[PDB]
A paper describes a structure:
Extensive screening yielded one crystal form that contained both components and had useful, anisotropic diffraction to ∼3.4 Å resolution. Adding an AF2-predicted [name] model to the MR search gave a solution that allowed building and refinement of the complete [name]–[name] complex. [name] is bound to the periplasmic face of [name] and makes extensive interactions with both the plug and the barrel. The total interface area is 1,640 Å2, with 14 hydrogen bonds and four salt bridges. Strikingly, several [name] residues (Ile39-Trp46) occupy space where the N-terminal switch helix of free [name] would be, indicating that [name] has bound to a nonnative conformation of [name]. Both loops fold inward to completely occlude the plug domain in [name]-bound [name]. We propose that [name] has jammed the plug of [name] and that any TonB pulling does not remove the phage lipoprotein from the transporter.
To elucidate the mechanism of SE via potential TBDT structure modulation, we report here the cryo-EM structure of the [name]–pb5 complex and the X-ray crystal structure of the [name]–[name] complex. Our structures show that the phage lipoprotein [name] exploits the known allostery in the plug of [name] in the opposite direction as during ferrichrome import (i.e., from the periplasmic side to the extracellular side).
Residue numbers in the entry:
A (entry chain B): 1 to 62
B (entry chain A): 38 to 714
Write the structure that this text describes.
């Protein structure tokens, strides 16, 4: 339903919870907040670039 | 060496975060979760005294607070509860239909798990100013950073100072909160986060009743009461002080074992010297009122008879939860076993003095003359003391496992509680002692599709204790719940949307509908069976627009109360929905503007247990605007304006009986200026 989708995924991020490292699919970036979309991670679409451990693949956005 | 697995166990389907908190800056936790499904928070109307809410018909724990705060059960008993300002909260999630047994002591339907603001290893220097209508001026300060290069030692100090003039003319609201916090994190498998909270509220605000007359039905004159009518006296005071200290600890030994322990020592206390209205002389109540009897049959319709109450309480709470996480795997069925114990010690000393019928004079309504009152007068004919001391001790062992097979997840847990309770009436020397022993278990099954679709069905129980107490020290029976919940959640791996739906059949026993005809001392009643459907839609249509919507159907009746058997409880709307959206004008002439607007609807609700009169359906519209000073050089700093009830609609929120209704909230404007360094 959203304008985005599975093809508009730019990069992936990494975060830890329950002492295991996980992944999150990232989209656009606003200042210092990523638009990650697993939802089951930060609880909101617009998550700040701090909840993650190694953005890595998100080194090229602008 | 895989691409690292994303998350797929359905979580955080209703959390509001700091990014959502700093965008709405809710005046209270009554807001924030104002647009989340399954909750109706405008039940009290316009009163920052308590933060109660109706999830699936049933409200707060023993009517006190069914909410959690960094684990544990918050606290509260006999009107001495704890409130927390959202400015001290990093995350405030509302969990509808929890399948865990750690929440078995809570309601099977809903739960508000609040999370304090944790220290950040990154420098945060925030200063917030927000001011607007009704002499409102809240000043915030939040400063967190690390203390060493590795970040093993980190700190956080958040604090609040709000003073405001309540809507009801004569009542003031003042809250001063400060929460120190510290976090020690040597390695990645150890954390000892210390959390404390200190809040002094010299004036809680307004907490009174208004008859069904001028509120919902035109008064004898033909007009209706004003939106800001204070039926109490000028010297009405209402204070509260909360002191909390605790920690949250967790350590992972092997990749199969993990220990966790949570703790909190709280010391909450409150004092009240207020006069509350008990309906006009024409009300079915009073009747035996002498002041109301000496009136003509035409003047009894516009003369409000009231009562007064003086109270002083002191709470000492202690809570402990210690669990062990065993993450082994049998055959090809992975496991995550939780084994823990909890503890609880409560102690509340009530030294109150109540006022019976004809304890105060009468208000004219057409010509109110709200004066002062001698709360220190103890006339033996209209007043009476109530010196009670309540003590509780609960101890429950819980075991829960989350078994995973291929794409099937089954959540199953079981808990056994040893609940003790003791009350002492200092007047008649009566000492009641109630020890209960009950088993409760929760179980949920769901299937995990690859795209994110997840249909689930769960059976929920609960051993929710009784928080309140009755006149003469009646230890209420604990409440036992039973809920059948089925539904389907969509947690997409790829696209940024969220849609979930559910239908439930919750049944809770030994419920208390309060109001033993006379006095607000509450009364025992029958069980309630609640049925309804909740749906939620949370997505981000393009980068500029974010949308959130929800609808909640609710149908509950008394099951075995004979008197009101087969009637819907008051303050519960049948239909309920809300919707909100916000645009972000980035990359443009106004790169920084963030325009947002939304509306809330609450269906028709009943006003008394006998279902005599009905409260009309209302619709409130909010809006807000926010511009980030990125064009001036202040990255992260923004100035925002907030409007609640845009068109200013006069509505009655809900009523508990004929002699008590609650006016809504008029238009509120707030100008926020938060700065980050």
């Amino acid at each position: 339903c959203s304008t985005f989708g599975p093809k508009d995924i730019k990069c992936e991020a990494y975060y830890m919870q329950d002492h295991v490292k996980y992944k999150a699919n990232v989209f656009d970036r606003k200042g210092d907040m990523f638009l990650v979309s697993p939802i089951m991670a930060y609880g909101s679409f617009w998550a700040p670039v701090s909840y993650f451990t190694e953005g890595n693949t998100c080194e090229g956005v602008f | 060496k895989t691409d690292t697995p994303i998350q797929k166990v359905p979580q955080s389907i209703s959390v509001v975060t700091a990014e959502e908190m700093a965008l709405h800056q809710p005046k209270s936790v009554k807001e924030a979760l104002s647009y989340t499904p399954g909750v109706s928070v405008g039940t009290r109307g316009a009163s920052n005294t308590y933060d109660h809410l109706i999830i699936r018909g049933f409200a707060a724990e023993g009517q006190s607070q069914n909410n959690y705060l960094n684990g544990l059960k918050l606290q509260g008993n006999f009107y001495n509860d704890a409130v927390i300002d959202p400015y001290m909260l990093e995350r405030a999630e509302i969990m509808r239909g929890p399948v865990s047994v750690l929440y078995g002591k809570s309601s099977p339907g809903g739960l508000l798990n609040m999370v304090s603001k944790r220290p950040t290893t990154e420098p945060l220097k925030e200063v917030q100013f927000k001011a607007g209508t009704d002499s409102l001026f809240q000043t915030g300060f939040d400063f967190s950073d690390s203390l060493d290069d590795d970040g093993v030692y980190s700190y956080r100090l958040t604090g609040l100072a709000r003073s405001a003039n309540a809507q009801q003319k004569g009542s003031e609201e003042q809250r001063y909160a400060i929460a120190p916090a510290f976090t020690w994190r040597p390695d990645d498998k150890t954390n000892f986060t210390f959390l404390s909270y200190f809040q002094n509220e010299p004036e809680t605000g307004y907490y009174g009743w208004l008859p069904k007359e001028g509120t919902v039905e035109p008064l004898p004159n033909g007009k209706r009461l004003p939106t800001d009518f204070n039926e109490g006296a000028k010297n009405n005071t209402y204070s509260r002080n909360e002191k909390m200290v605790g920690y949250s600890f967790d350590h992972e030994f092997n990749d199969t074992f993990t220990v966790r322990q949570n703790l909190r020592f709280a010391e909450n206390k409150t004092s009240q010297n207020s006069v509350y209205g008990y309906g006009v002389c024409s009300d079915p109540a009073n009747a035996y009122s002498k002041q109301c009897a000496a009136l003509a049959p035409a003047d009894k319709g516009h003369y409000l008879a009231r009562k007064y109450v003086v109270d002083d309480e002191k709470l000492q709470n202690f809570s402990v939860d210690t669990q062990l996480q065993s993450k082994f795997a049998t055959g090809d069925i992975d496991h995550t076993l939780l084994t823990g114990v909890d503890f609880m010690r409560m102690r509340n000393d009530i030294n109150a003095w109540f006022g019976y019928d004809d304890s105060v004079p009468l208000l004219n309504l057409y010509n109110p003359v709200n004066t002062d009152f001698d709360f220190n007068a103890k006339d033996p004919a209209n007043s009476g003391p109530y010196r009670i001391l309540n003590k509780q001790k609960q101890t429950g062992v819980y075991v829960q496992d989350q078994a995973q097979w291929d794409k099937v997840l089954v959540t199953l847990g079981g808990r056994y509680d040893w609940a003790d309770q003791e009350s002492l009436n200092r007047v008649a020397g009566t000492t009641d002692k109630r020890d209960d022993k009950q088993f409760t278990w929760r179980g949920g099954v769901n299937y995990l599709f690859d795209n994110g679709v997840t249909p689930y069905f769960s059976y929920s129980e609960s051993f929710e204790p009784s928080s309140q107490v009755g006149k003469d020290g009646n230890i209420f029976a604990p409440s036992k719940g039973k809920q059948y919940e089925v539904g389907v959640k969509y947690v997409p791996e790829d696209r940024p949307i969220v849609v979930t739906g559910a239908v439930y059949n919750l049944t809770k026993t030994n419920n208390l509908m309060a109001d033993p005809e006379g006095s607000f001392f509450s009364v025992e009643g029958g069980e309630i069976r609640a049925r309804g459907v909740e749906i939620e839609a949370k997505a981000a249509l393009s980068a500029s627009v974010n949308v959130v919507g929800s609808y909640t159907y609710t149908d509950a009746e008394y099951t075995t109360d004979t008197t009101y058997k087969g009637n819907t409880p008051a303050q519960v709307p049948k239909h309920m929905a809300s919707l909100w959206a916000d645009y972000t004008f980035f990359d443009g002439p106004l790169s920084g503007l963030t325009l947002g607007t939304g509306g809330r609807y609450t269906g028709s609700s009943y006003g008394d247990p006998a279902n005599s009169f009905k409260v009309g359906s209302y619709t409130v519209v909010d809006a807000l605007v926010r511009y980030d000073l990125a064009r001036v050089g202040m990255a992260g700093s923004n100035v925002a304006l907030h409007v609640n009830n845009l068109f200013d609609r006069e509505y009655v929120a809900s009523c508990f009986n004929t002699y008590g209704c609650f006016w809504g909230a008029e238009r509120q404007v707030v100008a926020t200026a938060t700065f980050r360094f």
